[PDB]
A and B are shown apart, each in its own frame.
Chain A
Amino acid sequence: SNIIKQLEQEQMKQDVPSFRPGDTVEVKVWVVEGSKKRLQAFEGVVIAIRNRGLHSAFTVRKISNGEGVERVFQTHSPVVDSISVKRRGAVRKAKLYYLRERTGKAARIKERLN
């Protein structure tokens, strides 16, 4: 209702870049490494996007050294400093969960470049 709708949009950040699933996105996340407050990087493929306003979240699959890591990010959290689109991908599906069995040359996806 309007009580919650008011209470949520006072809290949402207002600079979120418009990204689509399939985009290679480098999400840059605060991490507390003991005493120092480091900002580290996470660069993978956006395989899913949840849109709920303040509760919106996106899941980024990164194939790291060894096996793949599927980290999801709460979008309006203060832990995510910078979301930055590196490469734009041309899929035609809102959820890329077929990409979990596909590895390597079958896992690569199409550039948009339109």
Chain B
Amino acid sequence: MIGLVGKKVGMTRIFTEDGVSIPVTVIEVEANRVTQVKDLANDGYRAIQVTTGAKKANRVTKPEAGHFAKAGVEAGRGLWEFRLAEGEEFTVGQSISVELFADVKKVDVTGTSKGKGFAGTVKRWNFRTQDATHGNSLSHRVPGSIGQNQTPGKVFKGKKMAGQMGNERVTVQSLDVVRVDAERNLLLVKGAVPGATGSDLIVKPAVKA
């Protein structure tokens, strides 16, 4: 089926009765109101796009405000788009809520991870640091060799080198849902999801199930 867009609210834990403490991530999922429905008659693929939360009146532009009045919805922060799966059908304004995940059992969470900056080869690609002593001159954490010799004569493409780490879309798969809390608009997945506290998260059910 489709998934929903929500915001990450820290981490907690749930002491279950049987003597187990399972760590949960509190994901708040407000109402995801649909702004546009797509189909093969106009687009070639059938999908919807939703929006969540709220924005200010002055911060939203003129093209984005005329796109929301087309749907009749409240203006919401950004737009995300979900591919429909040939069995369901939504309308423009159908306020999709966290009631979908009382059906499901395991989810997939996608969010922009935490950014580490220009990270070196020991941190980014898990390289072994060289020896801290025994003669070593200015070459402790440096990456070592990067190529062979005259016969390649180059560095091969895709070489594990130092650079931008994090700040990148990643999907942790197959996370258990612990509680679907519909009065509080809360989803409690089990374990760790990407991104800092307050980032966006795209929770959809487990494709590998």
| Contact pattern, B 3-20, Cβ under 8 Å of A = 1, otherwise 0 | 000000110111111010
Complex CA distance for A3 and B184, rounded to whole angstroms: 8
What are the interface flags for A38-80 relative to B under an 8 Å C-beta threshold, 1 for contact and 0 otherwise? 0000000000000000110000000000000000001011110
Contact yes or no, A4 B19, CB < 8 A: no
- Across-interface contacts of A30 in B (CB, < 8 A): 19
Number of chain B residues whose Cβ lies closer than 8 Å to a Cβ of chain A: 14
Partner of B21, one of A6, A7, A8, A74: A74
Q: Residues 3-31 of chain A: 1 if any B CB is under 8 Å from the residue's CB, otherwise 0? A: 11011100100000000000000000010
- Is the CB–CB distance between B9 and A3 below 8 Å? yes
Interface centre among A3, A6, A11, by most chain B C-beta atoms within 10 angstroms, is: A3
Does B37 touch A at the CB level, under 8 Å?
no
**B186 pairs with A55, CB closer than 8 A:** no
Q: How many residues of A contact B (CB 8 A)?
A: 16
Question: What is the count of residue pairs linking A and B with beta-carbon distances less than 8 angstroms?
Answer: 35
> In whole angstroms, how far apart are the Cα atoms of A7 and B13 in the complex?
10
B17 & A78 in contact (Cβ 8 Å cutoff): yes
A1 and B14 contact, CB distance less than 8 A: no
Decide if B12 touches A79 in the complex (CB within 8 Å): no
Assess whether A3 is in contact with B19, with CB atoms less than 8 Å apart: no
A1 to B15, CA, bound (A): 20
Measured CB to CB, the closest approach of chain B to A52, in angstroms, equals 11
**Can you name the residue of chain B whose Cβ is closest to the Cβ of A12?**
B15
Say yes or no: A1 contacts B19, CB within 8 Å.
Answer: no
Residue of A nearest to B14 (CB): A11
CB<8 Å pairs between A and B, sample of 20: A3-B9, A3-B28, A3-B184, A6-B184, A7-B12, A7-B26, A7-B186, A8-B12, A11-B14, A54-B12, A54-B13, A55-B13, A74-B21, A76-B15, A77-B15, A77-B21, A78-B15, A78-B16, A78-B17, A79-B19
- Residues of A whose CB lies within 8 Å of any CB of B are 1, 3-4, 6-8, 11, 30, 32, 54-55, 74, 76-79
B residues neighboring A (CB under 8 Å)? 9-10, 12-17, 19, 21, 26, 28, 184, 186
